[PDB]
Ligand binder design. Sequence first.
Ligand SMILES: O=C(O)COc1ccc2c(c1)C(=NO)c1cc(OCC(=O)O)ccc1-2
Length: 263
Amino acid sequence: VEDWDLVQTLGEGAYGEVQLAVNRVTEEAVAVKIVDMKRCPENIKKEICINKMLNHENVVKFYGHRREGNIQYLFLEYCSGGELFDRIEPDIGMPEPDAQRFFHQLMAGVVYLHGIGITHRDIKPENLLLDERDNLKISDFGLATVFRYNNRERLLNKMCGTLPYVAPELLKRREFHAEPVDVWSCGIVLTAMLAGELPWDQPSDSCQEYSDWKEKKTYLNPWKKIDSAPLALLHKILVENPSARITIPDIKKDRWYNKPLKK
Ligand SMILES: O=C(O)COc1ccc2c(c1)C(=NO)c1cc(OCC(=O)O)ccc1-2
């Protein structure tokens, strides 16, 4: 209903929905995200402003914005693959070779964002959309924010994202660096793909399962399901002191990351 028709509901979140929109002339498809500024106008001015900076093969394409009353419409690549969340078999995961591919692509996407000084802040499988040839695209810049401007980094102080994905320091410190938290959530997504389960509800000393990982009890799952090469990488990503935690340029030199698996 706006030059294009709204065919089916797609991602009914809080604040609005995402629809599938076909143009009836050209037959082309898009995702219309629909935010009713009555049911924030501030976090939404940022989303689109961030979205206009973005252009990469692993980040959902931004086509434009119209205001139509209270109603903001963001015109967004439609990913006919859907969510990576759905290619994770509960308790089992997915073939190592697909995980490694999705991880290569997620890395590419994140390097990109980080190189333009943007942290996504909410990387989880629900936010990783797949296109028609199963290429992974980083989605939903609703919580994204700028952490380098004019070549100066600034620490974040707002807590956000999704607890099982979040990095311990975001719980513990008043200010933290933006990049390592994005790395940590990327690691949790790896664990998710390779084991089909989340290792803990939040990285708290108060959280049993989290305490067992710091004690290297990798004899429990989801670790036992994982396999020594990728698990060695997870050991370098899910490090607690954000400063000792591996960085992306170094993930790119890790053995499992550079292992041939897939045709
Ligand atoms: O193939 C299917 O079964 C459905 O395909 C989908 C399913 C969910 C979503 C899409 C495509 C999207 N394409 O862009 C999409 C975008 C979304 O954006 C959310 C945001 O920007 O917050 C959310 C859900 C979906």
